[PDB]
Write a protein that binds this ligand. Structure first.
Ligand SMILES: CNC(=O)NC(=N)NCCC[C@H](NC(=O)C[N-][N+]#N)C(=O)N(Cc1ccccc1)Cc1ccccc1
Length: 497
């Protein structure tokens, strides 16, 4: 069996690069030296983030970046490869701040992919940056192209792919070829922007790293788990926006693929990808958060889950009330709404009044502060057992996480992921996946194996009848049908032999 990818973001802001030091955590909280040899061996990829696209429509460092310091920080990451010959140091272009619809560089993303000439110039700059700084591949985190941008974006990925392949040959890197990945939407609403062209988007990639987290946040009316593996029938449900994608499918095909409303979960996003023909499970990487999302003003009853709340949604955080009791990092970062797993462990250990609770449907933990009305949705080594098992069972390519600086000091989240995939003595064959709600959609890419009596010409088939014919199992949509399955619109392809 081939090794699961373990992809960790390394995020460092420009001011920290410009003042880079390994001996002052109040200037750089998580320097490269915290990535020990043992961590380096547990990772397959580190995604250095974030570069940007400039107004010249080229991949570029933030213009305030000190170049010598940048090279130095990158050199420190690539030196980690000494401990792990499989390890790649990628760089990521984009992120939410640079690339969101209202982000500071958004128009550069749109314009870079818009014409053949712009794509060539952009693609070349990506490979030039990669070679200049010693990176091992390119990750694109544009959140998110839409509409006519999608065709440009696909052409841009195809062109970057060809240039990476040229570079792999030029460098004799066939043992560790240069790679191309993107960070993909992990929820139907954003995914619907490019969903109909998913196979084309994924074809040029080594992996699509699904952002299957941030599925709950202060923008929602109701608290919820941000990365539930499976659904909880007591939780909120959402309109399935994919059924409105430009797919050209029939009513029955849409309905069978896109139940609505549906539970917004990791399993939903993964299945939504697998339903598409030409999207291989081995390219799908499951993102997990190394941080929790915190809400205030929540009611009692169900541990703070699925409650109204009074958490500000504005950015930046609009006042100086840091109400996440015990979160020192929140004070430092002026935002009580996000806490690293590292910080959450300390909050749980201190005398701050949190209970750690567990939802056995979603297979995720949450903190509840009964006295102040606080709710925190996060992941730990325990929720990772179910996710890693799901990853193995669904034959996904691996796991990605945001971000390395958020693991605890011992790096237990990373070590847990590595152990669940690679430890000879770890056994999850008996781990019970629970009865949480599964996403049941079936599309052309994930037909189940089925059997049925062979189709017989001259027979009149009632609605709902199942037959096998030319490699597939088919179901009549109404009765009485006598046509050969697949030859007109009366038959639904429901399974494969
Ligand atoms: C590798 N790429 C990603 O992981 N991308 C990603 N998570 N994109 C969506 C995130 C949107 C943004 N996310 C975070 O703050 C993640 N936190 N961490 N760690 C987000 O939640 N908001 C948009 C934003 C954030 C910062 C600056 C500008 C815009 C809204 C928000 C609401 C409440 C607290 C923090 C952010």
């Amino acid at each position: 069996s081939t090794r699961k990818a373990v992809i960790g973001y390394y995020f460092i802001p420009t001011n920290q690069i410009n003042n880079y030091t390994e001996t002052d955590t109040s200037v750089v909280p998580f320097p490269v030296s915290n990535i020990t040899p043992a961590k380096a061996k547990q990772l397959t990829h580190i995604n250095f983030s974030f570069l940007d696209i400039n107004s010249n429509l080229e991949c570029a460092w933030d213009p305030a970046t000190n170049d010598a310091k940048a090279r130095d920080v990158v050199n420190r990451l690539t030196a980690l490869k000494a401990h792990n010959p499989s390890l790649r140091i990628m760089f990521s272009i984009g992120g939410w701040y640079y690339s969101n619809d209202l982000g500071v560089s958004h128009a550069n993303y749109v314009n870079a992919v818009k014409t053949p000439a712009a794509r060539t110039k952009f693609a070349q700059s990506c490979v030039r940056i990669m070679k200049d700084y010693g990176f091992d591949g390119v990750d694109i985190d544009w959140e998110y192209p839409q509409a006519a941008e999608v065709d440009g974006f696909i052409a841009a990925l195809q062109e970057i792919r060809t240039l990476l392949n040229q570079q792999t040959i030029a460098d004799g890197r066939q043992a560790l070829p240069y790679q191309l990945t993107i960070a993909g939407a992990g929820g139907a609403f954003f995914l619907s922007r490019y969903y109909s062209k998913l196979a084309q988007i994924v074809a040029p990639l080594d992996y699509i790293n699904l952002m299957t987290y941030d599925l709950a946040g202060p923008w929602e009316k109701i608290t919820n788990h941000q990365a539930a593996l499976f659904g909880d029938a007591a939780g909120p449900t959402f309109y399935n926006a994919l059924r409105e994608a430009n797919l050209g499918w029939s009513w029955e095909e849409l309905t069978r693929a896109f139940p609505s409303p549906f539970s917004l979960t990791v399993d939903a996003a993964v299945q939504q990808h697998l339903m598409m023909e030409g999207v291989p499970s081995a390219k799908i990487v499951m993102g997990v958060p190394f941080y929790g999302r915190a809400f205030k003003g929540v009611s009692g009853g169900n541990g703070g889950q699925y409650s109204s709340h009074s958490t500000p949604g504005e950015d930046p955080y609009p006042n100086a009330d840091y109400w996440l009791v015990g979160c020192d990092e929140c004070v430092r970062d002026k935002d009580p709404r996000i806490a690293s797993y590292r910080q959450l462990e300390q909050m749980l250990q201190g005398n701050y009044g949190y209970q750690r609770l567990w939802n056995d449907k979603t297979k995720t933990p949450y903190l509840y502060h009964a006295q102040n009305g606080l709710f925190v949705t996060y992941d730990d080594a325990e929720s990772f057992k179910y996710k890693a098992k799901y990853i193995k069972q669904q034959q996904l390519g691996g796991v990605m996480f945001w971000h390395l600086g958020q693991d605890n000091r011992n790096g237990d989240l990373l070590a847990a992921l590595d152990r669940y995939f690679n430890a000879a003595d770890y056994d999850d064959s008996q781990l019970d996946m629970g009865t949480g709600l599964r996403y049941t959609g079936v599309g052309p890419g994930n037909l189940p194996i089925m059997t049925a009596p062979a189709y017989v010409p001259g027979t009149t088939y009632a609605q709902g009848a199942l037959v096998s014919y030319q490699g597939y199992v088919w179901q009549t949509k109404w009765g009485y049908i006598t046509s050969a399955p697949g030859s007109d619109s009366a038959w639904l392809k429901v399974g494969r032999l």
